[PDB]
Design an enzyme around this catalytic site. Structure first.
Site, mmCIF file in Angstrom:
data_model
loop_
_atom_site.group_PDB
_atom_site.id
_atom_site.type_symbol
_atom_site.label_atom_id
_atom_site.label_comp_id
_atom_site.label_asym_id
_atom_site.label_seq_id
_atom_site.Cartn_x
_atom_site.Cartn_y
_atom_site.Cartn_z
ATOM 1 N N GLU A 72 122.398 -42.497 45.216
ATOM 2 C CA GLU A 72 121.293 -41.682 45.748
ATOM 3 C C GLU A 72 121.766 -40.436 46.505
ATOM 4 O O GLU A 72 121.266 -40.114 47.585
ATOM 5 C CB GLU A 72 120.358 -42.547 46.596
ATOM 6 C CG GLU A 72 119.715 -43.587 45.701
ATOM 7 C CD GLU A 72 118.708 -44.456 46.353
ATOM 8 O OE1 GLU A 72 118.440 -44.332 47.585
ATOM 9 O OE2 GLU A 72 118.196 -45.295 45.576
ATOM 10 N N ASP A 128 113.319 -51.536 35.881
ATOM 11 C CA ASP A 128 112.078 -52.319 36.024
ATOM 12 C C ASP A 128 110.905 -51.356 35.778
ATOM 13 O O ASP A 128 111.091 -50.133 35.811
ATOM 14 C CB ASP A 128 112.014 -53.093 37.358
ATOM 15 C CG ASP A 128 112.261 -52.229 38.606
ATOM 16 O OD1 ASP A 128 111.981 -51.011 38.578
ATOM 17 O OD2 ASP A 128 112.739 -52.816 39.621
ATOM 18 N N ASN A 171 125.226 -43.038 40.836
ATOM 19 C CA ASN A 171 123.995 -43.747 40.481
ATOM 20 C C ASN A 171 122.790 -43.117 41.165
ATOM 21 O O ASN A 171 122.879 -42.758 42.339
ATOM 22 C CB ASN A 171 124.153 -45.212 40.912
ATOM 23 C CG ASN A 171 123.071 -46.134 40.337
ATOM 24 O OD1 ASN A 171 122.836 -46.177 39.121
ATOM 25 N ND2 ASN A 171 122.450 -46.921 41.215
ATOM 26 N N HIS A 224 113.865 -47.011 37.672
ATOM 27 C CA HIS A 224 112.776 -47.694 38.367
ATOM 28 C C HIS A 224 111.502 -46.945 37.997
ATOM 29 O O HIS A 224 111.194 -45.915 38.586
ATOM 30 C CB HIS A 224 113.015 -47.695 39.871
ATOM 31 C CG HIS A 224 114.096 -48.627 40.295
ATOM 32 N ND1 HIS A 224 114.031 -49.990 40.086
ATOM 33 C CD2 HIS A 224 115.277 -48.393 40.914
ATOM 34 C CE1 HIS A 224 115.113 -50.552 40.592
ATOM 35 N NE2 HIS A 224 115.895 -49.606 41.079
ATOM 36 N N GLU A 226 119.221 -50.190 36.764
ATOM 37 C CA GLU A 226 118.283 -50.970 37.607
ATOM 38 C C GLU A 226 116.865 -50.983 37.038
ATOM 39 O O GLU A 226 115.901 -50.824 37.762
ATOM 40 C CB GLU A 226 118.264 -50.460 39.054
ATOM 41 C CG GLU A 226 119.664 -50.160 39.634
ATOM 42 C CD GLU A 226 119.652 -49.671 41.070
ATOM 43 O OE1 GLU A 226 118.574 -49.697 41.710
ATOM 44 O OE2 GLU A 226 120.737 -49.283 41.552
#
Length: 302
Positions: free
Chosen positions: A131, A239, A172, A209, A237
């Protein structure tokens, strides 16, 4: 455990793995361990390798959770992505209160080297920096940027490479899901330049995400990420609010379409256990049964 394994089927399509986030808490409850054994080939610690978990006081490391995850993975033939070494969230106050450049540089290097050396040769990839970007593509104002400076990213990666040269070193981030979005373009530009400078960045990790309907854009965003020329990219990650087959299949197809995309990690096993549980965003339901999106991924991979 679903009959068809998405990890097996993605390997049949020439990818390295299809994995999930987990940790001791999940591995020792419900059907998570059995599902991971059957259906997934890689694990990321959802929390046990973060700074709060591992170095709650300076130089007083807590490896119990991380060791549990690594040992379980090795015993069960699962690859590991370490997550995450340098990040402004889940960061103890002892770190964020440091104002001296040398102090923080040495702290950061020690944190990186200690974790990576402990697991040296056992870890496929590390999210070294997480981030680092604002939504506008500028660098996020974190203690590392403010106190160490622009060099914190070079230093973090050079230190990581020195600690374990076998690991693929990732930067990431989230909201890298649209090719027209400033953040996506920015990370590509900065990774190209960092690599040309000699920063050992092996991978771009796209967290993925998503909210409903955002899968389609990943078809263009992932190739754009791959244009940075890193050896690897990965969906790290995944979802999706509502868990529509349409969104999930789009993200899988994006990875299939990108030669440097090594695999996909979904951010948990069963809906109730998601960090965004109320959005039921995962591939297994609260009965630990595969959802329509799981079956759709299977069918797409076959």
């Amino acid at each position: 455990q679903a009959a068809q394994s998405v990890d097996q089927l993605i390997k049949a399509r020439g990818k390295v793995y299809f994995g999930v986030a987990t940790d001791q808490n999940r591995l020792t409850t419900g059907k998570n361990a059995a599902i991971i054994q059957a259906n997934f080939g890689q694990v990321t610690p959802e929390n046990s390798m973060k700074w709060d978990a591992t170095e709650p006081s300076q130089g007083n490391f807590n490896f119990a959770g991380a060791d549990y995850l690594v040992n379980w993975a090795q015993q069960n033939g699962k690859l590991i992505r370490g997550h995450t070494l340098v990040w402004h969230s889940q960061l103890p106050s002892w770190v964020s209160s440091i104002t001296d450049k040398n102090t923080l540089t040495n702290v950061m290097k020690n944190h990186i080297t200690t974790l990576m050396t402990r697991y040296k040769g056992k870890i496929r990839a590390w999210d070294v920096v997480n981030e680092a970007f604002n939504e506008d593509g500028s660098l996020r104002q974190t203690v590392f940027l403010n106190v160490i400076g622009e060099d914190y990213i070079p230093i973090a990666f050079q230190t990581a490479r020195a600690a374990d040269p076998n690991a693929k070193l990732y930067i990431n981030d989230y909201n890298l899901d649209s090719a027209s979005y400033p953040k996506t373009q920015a990370i590509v530009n900065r990774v190209k330049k960092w690599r040309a400078a000699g920063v050992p960045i092996d991978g771009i990790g796209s967290q993925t995400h998503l909210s409903a309907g955002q899968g389609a854009g990943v078809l263009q965003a992932l190739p754009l990420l791959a244009s940075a020329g890193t050896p690897e990219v990965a969906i790290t990650e995944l979802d999706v609010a509502g868990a529509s087959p349409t969104d999930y299949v789009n993200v899988v197809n994006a990875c299939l379409n990108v030669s440097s995309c090594v695999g996909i990690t979904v951010w948990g096993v069963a809906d109730p256990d998601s960090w965004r549980a109320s959005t039921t965003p995962l591939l297994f339901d609260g009965n630990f049964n595969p959802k329509p999106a799981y079956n759709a991924i299977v069918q797409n991979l076959q």
